[PDB]
Design a protein around this ligand. Structure first.
Ligand SMILES: N=C(N)c1ccc(NC(=O)c2ccccc2O)cc1
Length: 222
């Protein structure tokens, strides 16, 4: 996450860190004790999910680790266009909830008026390094027309754009699958955007979670 700052320790209990071969890969969102929501392009072998983490460089009393027993990629996911970039991960062990481990409710209404949004993650910072401490930034949803002009013919109804006109606060590599939180609900998932990272002109592109509330419910209830 570029041009942001360290999160408040108690403000991200739904944040998951996804590992493969002992390295941070992506973010994720805890949405149910047994399920983590992430981006489909984060699919790697033997995924390890860490909940209750703030600083990845230290062991923390609140952390809970789980292997993934099931990875459910959306059936219409298209790697090339990042369309329908969503995946559900079933945890081997249901998450032990605490003040630092809690699910985040999803936004079900695609017509939600809120634009008081924030992003979070352990992705690349402005200096190019990977932070040990989780980063946070407030961003705003960008109109569909403006996003369509920024990325001609790349924006589907399954994507939502967000950014910041002032400093270009944006998500980056490693933040993928992480949450775009609007009005204390999950509104989007970090999917793709401008390289180098910066949202002043080209906003970040997020999976539009409200479009998937039926598919999520059917997967969890299967
Ligand atoms: N500007 C943005 N909002 C943005 C840019 C890039 C990524 N992700 C990547 O570049 C990436 C690259 C390799 C592997 C995984 C990734 O997520 C995520 C968000």
């Amino acid at each position: 996450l570029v041009h942001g700052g360290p999160c408040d320790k108690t403000s991200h209990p739904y944040q998951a860190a996804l590992y493969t071969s002992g390295h941070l890969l992506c973010g994720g969102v805890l949405i149910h004790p047994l399920w983590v929501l992430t981006a489909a392009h984060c699919k790697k072998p033997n995924l390890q999910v860490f909940l209750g983490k703030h600083n990845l460089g230290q062991q923390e009393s609140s952390q809970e680790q789980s292997s993934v027993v099931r990875a459910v990629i959306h059936p219409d996911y298209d790697a090339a266009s990042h369309d329908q970039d969503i995946m559900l991960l079933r945890l081997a062990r249901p998450a032990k909830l605490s003040e630092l481990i809690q699910p985040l409710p999803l936004e079900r209404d695609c017509s939600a008026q809120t634009t008081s949004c924030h992003i979070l993650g352990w992705g690349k910072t402005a200096d190019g390094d990977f932070p040990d401490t989780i980063q946070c930034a407030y961003i705003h949803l960008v109109s569909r027309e403006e996003c369509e002009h920024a990325y001609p013919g790349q924006i589907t109804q399954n994507m939502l754009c967000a950014g910041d006109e002032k400093y270009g606060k944006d998500s980056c590599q490693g933040d993928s699958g992480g949450p775009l939180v609007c009005g204390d609900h999950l509104r989007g998932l970090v999917s793709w955007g401008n390289i180098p990272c910066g949202s002043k002109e080209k906003p970040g592109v997020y999976t539009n979670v409200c479009r998937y509330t039926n598919w999520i419910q059917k997967t969890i209830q299967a």
